[PDB]
Amino acid sequence: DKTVRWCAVSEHEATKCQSFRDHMKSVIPSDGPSVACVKKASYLDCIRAIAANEADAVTLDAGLVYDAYLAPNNLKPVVAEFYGSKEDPQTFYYAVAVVKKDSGFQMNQLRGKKSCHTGLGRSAGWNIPIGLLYCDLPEPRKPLEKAVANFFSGSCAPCADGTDFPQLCQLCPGCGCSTLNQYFGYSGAFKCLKDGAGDVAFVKHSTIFENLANKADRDQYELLCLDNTRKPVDEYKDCHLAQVPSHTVVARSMGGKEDLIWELLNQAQEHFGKDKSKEFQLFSSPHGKDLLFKDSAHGFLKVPPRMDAKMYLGYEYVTAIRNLREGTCPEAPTDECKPVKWCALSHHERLKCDEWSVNSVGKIECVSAETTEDCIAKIMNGEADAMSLDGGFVYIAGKCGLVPVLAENYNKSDNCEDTPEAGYFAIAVVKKSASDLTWDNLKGKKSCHTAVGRTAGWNIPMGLLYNKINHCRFDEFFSEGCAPGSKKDSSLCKLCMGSGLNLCEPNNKEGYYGYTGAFRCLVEKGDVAFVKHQTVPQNTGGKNPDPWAKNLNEKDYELLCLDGTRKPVEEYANCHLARAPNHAVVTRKDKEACVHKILRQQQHLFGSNVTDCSGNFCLFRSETKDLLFRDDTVCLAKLHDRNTYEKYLGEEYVKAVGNLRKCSTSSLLEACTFRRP
């Protein structure tokens, strides 16, 4: 009925929901977002209600968001509350482990150390840390309080049972569950570390900032990272035990009215949001506290539609809560790397992966997903481990927290596994004839692109020029040009040749298609052409027999540079738009070492050493084309220092694809950006 049935868990919430209803009726048009109220006994009954189509939306803490996700409910986050500004929303907080500088231990070696918890049963203080360390605990892990007591050599766990397990109160005897215990809560847990009682304090990111105003004092503290490294306390976003959403509205995954819910809550915060009206305070509780929404909430934000619970909570939070609830660890905790789960994007990719798996003798396993973004999501949540990606998807995967580990090398050499190729150089070519041309005044000139959606011919150049575009109409920057794959009637199709049906088409039929074609576009009808550094040489000195390219001199053309200067073709290395990276294998950081190791083995067994791809299995050969890896892949090379998407792609490339993604939307990128801007 275009009506949103909100579920309340108390009589107080029901009343507020009724006020919310009546008021929203007075300000919203006859045909607009309406609200009905449904009262149930608890949050769980509300989750079941929504799943049963008896309600539509409820706001939940992280733990209950996970509950709502499980079957048969299958709810998902749709709207989130934020507690800061539009620039600093603070939708999430980060559970971190604070420690003294140079204490001499990491996450993987916390046994025998002393711990300070905010309180037993709390998220950052207990559930999350203990969830992650669950398998590192001694058996029997049940009851849990006992297992933790044995793991640490003394600690402070407020509200714990000191009578049966006194070791948990060693740092705060009695385990006082009130502020009377100086080591209770966030302030207390931090003080437990500060006074030297404990070695580590499991708290929020903001905790140390609340208990120490001088940065000089904070410098003696640092955080434990899950990759068993330490970092400064203000780098918690890169070093945290988990990332937690504070308050999130959930609805059905299918037919949950997520758009309608957003419409409702959006107009709601508009009229009755924070300090918006005196008639009704959406984020104020007249009777109770934190009714329907947290009272500290400043407003709402739409959760990107690609998001699901697993992705929203993060692999850390899910790992922890699963460990506590399921309580399953490998009975044979062998230090050998588990099979690498490769992700296949197609039927043929899967068939090749299946052959690879059999030959690997269990070292490789296979998982299928519908699209590239689905595979990335699977690597994020753990349903898969590794996959090969091009530059654009390495960028998206990087924004999603994954890291590159191995690059595909395409050049034949004696030792390619130790010489990662940075790829060719994308450059902008213009004739020496027009001396007025410069990277700045390209606006209104004639351009030649290999094709739309191309690294050197389009994405890099048009991405860097985006600041000059100021919008998403890229055919309006250049007066005319040839960019195969455009709308045909576009200005970027005006200079194209080809035939009627093959006009402005991305294929051989178009004569101005490709690097050579864009060069043809340049020499015949055009001012600038975007290609790679080997294009001009290969098409000059008589090296190209075609008539138009029959007799051209390399010295007749020059490269545009970013700062505005010009140089000859020979100096492409110092004058270029950006470097076009090779494909690279990406994975989750915790799986980097294993993926890096096992692939090397597989590479040596089935790489470019085999001759009979018939009698053996060739990893870099495809029954069709470029399955899992590019067929012209010589070998996979270790990346050394370039083990992040920023370091691997380069500043100009990430700048280009980043700007360009503002116009071309990616559902996955939206989601990952939401969790980490």
Contact 427, 534 (CB under 8 A): no
Residue span binding Ti ion (CB under 5 A) among the ranges 180-188, 229-237, 344-352, 454-462 = 454-462
| 350 annotated among ligand-binding-site residues | no
In the complex, what is the shortest distance from the CB of residue 630 to Ti ion, in angstroms, rounded to a whole number?
A: 12
Residue 455 or 602: which CB sits closer to Ti ion? 455
* Beta pairing partners, 53: none
The 3-state secondary structure of 59-106 reads EECHHHHHHHHCCCCCEEEEEEEECCCCCCCCCEEEEEEEEECCCCCC
Residue 205 DSSP SS3: coil
Choices 362-370, 453-461, 565-573, 581-589; region in contact with Ti ion by CB under 5 A: 453-461
* Cβ 352 to Ti ion shortest distance, Å: 24
Minimum separation from the CB atom of position 653 to Ti ion (A): 12
Where the chain is broken, by preceding residue (C–N > 2.5 Å)? none
From the number of C-beta atoms within 10 Å of its C-beta (0-12, 13-18, 19+), residue 508 rates as: exposed
Q: Give, as one character, the DSSP assignment of residue 56.
A: -
Judged by CB under 5 A, the stretch of 166-174, 329-337, 403-411, 447-455 that binds Ti ion is 447-455
Q: Where are the alpha helices (DSSP H) in 293-448?
A: 309-313, 315-326, 347-360, 372-381, 391-399
Whole-angstrom CA distances from 552 to 43, 514, 623 are: 76, 18, 40
Phi, psi of 270 (to 5 degrees): -65, -50
Question: Taking Cα atoms as reference points, which of 202, 199, 233 lies closest to residue 219?
Answer: 233
Q: How far is the CB of 580 from Ti ion (least distance, A)?
A: 6
| Residue 511 beta carbon to Ti ion: minimum distance, rounded to whole angstroms | 19
Is 424 within any annotated ligand binding site? yes
Contacts of 398 (CB under 8 A, 6+ apart): 404, 586, 644, 645, 646, 649
CB nearer Ti ion, residue 17 or residue 531: 531
Q: Is 576 annotated as a binding residue?
A: no
Q: Is 459 in the site for Ti ion (CB under 5 A)?
A: no
Which CB atom, from 273 or from 457, has the smaller least distance to Ti ion? 457
Residue count, binding to Ti ion (CB under 5 A): 1
Asked whether residue 372 is marked as a ligand-binding residue, the answer is no
Nearer to Ti ion, 158 or 581 (CB): 581
**Judged by CB, which is closer to Ti ion: 526, or 581?**
581
| Binds Ti ion by CB under 5 A, chosen from 409, 455, 486, 491 | 455
**Any known ligand binding at 583?**
yes
**Per-residue DSSP letter, 109:** G
Residues numbered 578-637 forming contacts with Ti ion, rule: CB under 5 A: none
- Stretch in the footprint of Ti ion (CB under 5 A) among 286-294, 431-439, 448-456, 481-489: 448-456
* 118 has binding-site annotation: yes
Residue sitting closest to Ti ion (CB): 455
Flag whether 513 is marked binding.
Answer: no
Tokens of 659: 């700007």
In whole angstroms, the minimum distance from the beta carbon of 634 to Ti ion comes to: 18
- CB of residue 424 to Ti ion, shortest distance in Å: 8
Q: How far is CA 351 from CA 298, 373, 526, in A?
A: 51, 20, 46
183 labelled ligand-binding:
no
Confirm or deny that 247 is annotated as ligand binding. Answer: yes
Helix (H, G, I), strand (E, B) or coil at 145: helix
- Over the window 407 to 446, marking each residue x when it contacts Ti ion by CB under 5 A and - when it does not, the resulting string is ----------------------------------------
Tell me the residue type at 193.
Answer: L
Strand partners, 95: 204, 242
| Distance in Å, CB of 355 to Ti ion, minimum | 29
According to the annotation, is 390 in a ligand binding site?
Answer: yes
Helix axes 592-606, 347-360, angle to 10 degrees: 80
527 is in an annotated binding site: no
d(CA 344, CA 358): 15
Are the C-beta atoms of 486 and 476 separated by less than 8 Å? no
Provide, rounded to whole angstroms, the least separation between the CB of residue 518 and Ti ion: 11
125 assigned binding-site residue: yes
Which residue, 360 or 539, has its beta carbon nearer to Ti ion?
539
- The binding site for Ti ion (CB under 5 A) comprises 455
From the annotation, which residues make up the binding site for hydrogencarbonate?
A: 118, 122, 124-125, 450, 454, 456-457
From the annotation, which residues make up the binding site?
A: 61, 93, 118, 122, 124-125, 186, 247, 390, 424, 450, 454, 456-457, 515, 583
From the annotation, which residues make up the binding site for Fe(3+)?
A: 61, 93, 186, 247, 390, 424, 515, 583
